[PDB]
Amino acid sequence: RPTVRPRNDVAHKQLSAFGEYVAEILPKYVQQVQVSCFNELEICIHPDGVIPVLTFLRDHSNAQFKSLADLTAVDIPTRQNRFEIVYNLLSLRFNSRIRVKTYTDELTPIESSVPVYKAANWYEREIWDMFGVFFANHPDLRRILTDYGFEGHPFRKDFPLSGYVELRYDDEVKRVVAEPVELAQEFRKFDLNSPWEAFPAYRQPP
């Protein structure tokens, strides 16, 4: 079938088997394990398990996930714990990838993973800057992307696209000043969603 992406059952089984393997070894922290239809393994863990679970995946002989590919966050306001923390790891030894996910809210710190992966340093600063998630015991937690003195965390779903302040040069004070944002043309919100269901396979029970 030329237009349909082919399945790979061999990889699906291997990843499923390793998913059970991880969950048997770390029952204290693993809450859910799933493999996607395009064969990506996700471990969902209690936030207490960050250091133990990441250390096990880095150091264990059947894991050896030596490379932290990415660390980011997702904001889902409807959840009690709105922030989902995502670790994407790579194992060169076994030519495999794994995703570890945990959660936190505005006021609950997450343990910094710099001790496991030195790559985590700047990623956690970016998560602090863009989402406002505090990482405990970080060697140097501060903003990395936003302007100095910037207020708020832009990547939160409830932060407006254009922010609250805009800059310009002011001649009277001979410097760049910040002022409440006004737009000559407001961003035009589009309602694009079709009112007809697209994917029956994902229908949520009513």
Binding site: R1, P2, T3, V4, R5, A11, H12, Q14, L15, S16, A17, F18, G19, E20, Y21, A23, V30, Q31, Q32, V33, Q34, V35, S36, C37, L41, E42, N62, A63, S91, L92, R93, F94, N95, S96, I98, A198, F199, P200, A201, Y202
Partner: protein, 94 residues
Amino acid sequence: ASATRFIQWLRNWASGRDLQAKLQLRYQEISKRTQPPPKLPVGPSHKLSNNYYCTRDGRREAMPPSIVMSSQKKAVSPAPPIKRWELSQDEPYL
């Protein structure tokens, strides 16, 4: 291409290469800027029969993730260990 014979010899000797065989500037060897019109082929879904969309609908074959464990034996690795690479036989060493 307009360089005199002496200048060609000079810059060839200075560079150590035969520069005239691989000039950086393009001349007549390039494609004409006007070409005959194309007639492109059509994909495998361009059929009048035996072509119902439900048999070639990739998006509708996507499924939600398979849950292998939820909070509701031999050891394994995520995949077989990667195989050692082989040294190039075209040119193993620069």
